[PDB]
From Swiss-Prot:
Induction: Up-regulated by inducers of the unfolded protein response (UPR), including tunicamycin and dithiothreitol. SUPFAM superfamilies: Thioredoxin-like. The gene is ERP44. Mediates thiol-dependent retention in the early secretory pathway, forming mixed disulfides with substrate proteins through its conserved CRFS motif. Inhibits the calcium channel activity of ITPR1. May have a role in the control of oxidative protein folding in the endoplasmic reticulum. Required to retain ERO1A and ERO1B in the endoplasmic reticulum. Residues 6-114 form the Thioredoxin domain. This is Endoplasmic reticulum resident protein 44. GO terms for biological process: cell redox homeostasis; glycoprotein metabolic process; protein folding; response to endoplasmic reticulum stress; response to unfolded protein.
Length: 377
């Protein structure tokens, strides 16, 4: 059973050339027998027509498809774990974020439109840097001229990483006070206690400039939102989460510092995250917490949820590390059923609870069997 399409089907021979030449490429990884791929097929067909009218130039937007049953080598090459999967490429480079939005013609076309727009904000006067929103990260390029090899590298990097960080540009007499060294790039971390970080590589070198900028864009503890929730679950690690009100920035700072202090050993075993408690009231209900109880630290193993004792305890050395260790050892699961493990210097005896710890809430944000063919479980 195959459904006809006018979109280019990739195989082992043509894939590298087609992906490398396309400034932007949207690639549908599908299987004939996936009912969700089947429903997406006509929508993907019409979206490519809408986009090719808006973007008809030689290589500016290219829709393509991969039959993952016939080309299992290609599917594994791009770590396809579900159908349908919509990957975005840029000059052959696979973007971290997949399209996970609504499956409609308008939504797909809008995504391309948004991706093709200019993400860099041009500053008009250097006093805008003083008024800069320091809740976010910011990367600022000071250039002599927009028509330069230096800017074209910056432009390319910004196109890749705009969803991760705000990119700002300054030109001419506006930027000349900051260009005694020539063109330069500056990273401004969140908060007013962190000093600037300057890029000392060659701004004509894409690989090096991208690598330095990308390194600044990825926080140690990422914020989980509805937008990135699926992607975060696909990293296959349990969640260690700080639930906090958006305004209370000191709990986050405290949390990030202790993760950096104690949990570097746990880099590839548990995912460090923080979450706006008012947007995540329903997950908090799984553990019977409300924004009133925040800051709240919890683990979600994608089978159960466990609560950290008290946020203050994160100051006590070793406690946070121990909380992670107790997950992997099954101690957290045991202490729910039987109370805290007695020791000789600290036990009255708690009631036994035969029923299970709270169910996972972030499993609900993982790629769903109700809209994908899932390959992993
Ligand atoms: Cl567990």
């Amino acid at each position: 059973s195959h459904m006809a399409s006018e979109i280019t089907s990739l195989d082992t021979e043509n894939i590298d050339e087609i992906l490398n030449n396309a400034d932007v490429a949207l690639v549908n990884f599908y299987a004939d027998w996936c009912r969700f791929s089947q429903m997406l097929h006509p929508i993907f067909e019409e979206a490519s027509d809408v986009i090719k009218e808006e973007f008809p130039n030689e290589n500016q937007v290219v829709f393509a498809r991969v039959d993952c049953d016939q080309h299992s080598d290609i599917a594994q090459r791009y770590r396809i774990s579900k159908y349908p999967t919509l990957k975005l490429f840029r000059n052959g480079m696979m973007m971290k974020r997949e399209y996970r939005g609504q499956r409609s013609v308008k939504a797909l076309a809008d995504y391309i439109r948004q991706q093709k727009s200019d993400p860099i904000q041009e500053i008009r006067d250097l006093a805008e840097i003083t008024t800069l929103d320091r809740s976010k990260r910011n990367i600022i390029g000071y250039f002599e001229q927009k028509d330069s090899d230096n800017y074209r590298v910056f432009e390319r990097v910004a196109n890749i990483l705009h969803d991760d960080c705000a990119f700002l540009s300054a030109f001419g007499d506006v930027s000349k006070p900051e260009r005694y060294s020539g063109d330069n790039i500056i990273y401004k971390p969140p908060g007013h206690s962190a000093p600037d970080m300057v890029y000392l590589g060659a701004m004509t070198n894409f690989d090096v400039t991208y690598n330095w900028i990308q390194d600044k864009c990825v926080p140690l503890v990422r914020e989980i939102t509805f937008e990135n929730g699926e992607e975060l679950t696909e990293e296959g690690l349990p969640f260690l989460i700080l639930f906090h009100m958006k305004e209370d920035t000191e709990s986050l700072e405290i949390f990030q510092n202790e993760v950096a202090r104690q949990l570097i050993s746990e880099k590839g075993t548990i995912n460090f995250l923080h979450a706006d408690c008012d947007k995540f009231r329903h997950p908090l209900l799984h553990i019977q917490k409300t924004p009133a109880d925040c800051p709240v630290i919890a683990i979600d193993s994608f089978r159960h949820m466990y609560v950290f004792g008290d946020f203050k305890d994160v100051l006590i050395p070793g406690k946070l590390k121990q909380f992670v260790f107790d997950l992997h050892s099954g101690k957290l699961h045991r202490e729910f059923h039987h109370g805290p493990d007695p020791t000789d210097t600290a036990p009255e005896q708690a009631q036994d609870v035969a029923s299970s710890p709270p169910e996972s809430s972030f499993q609900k944000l993982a790629p769903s069997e109700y809209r994908y063919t899932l390959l992993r479980d």
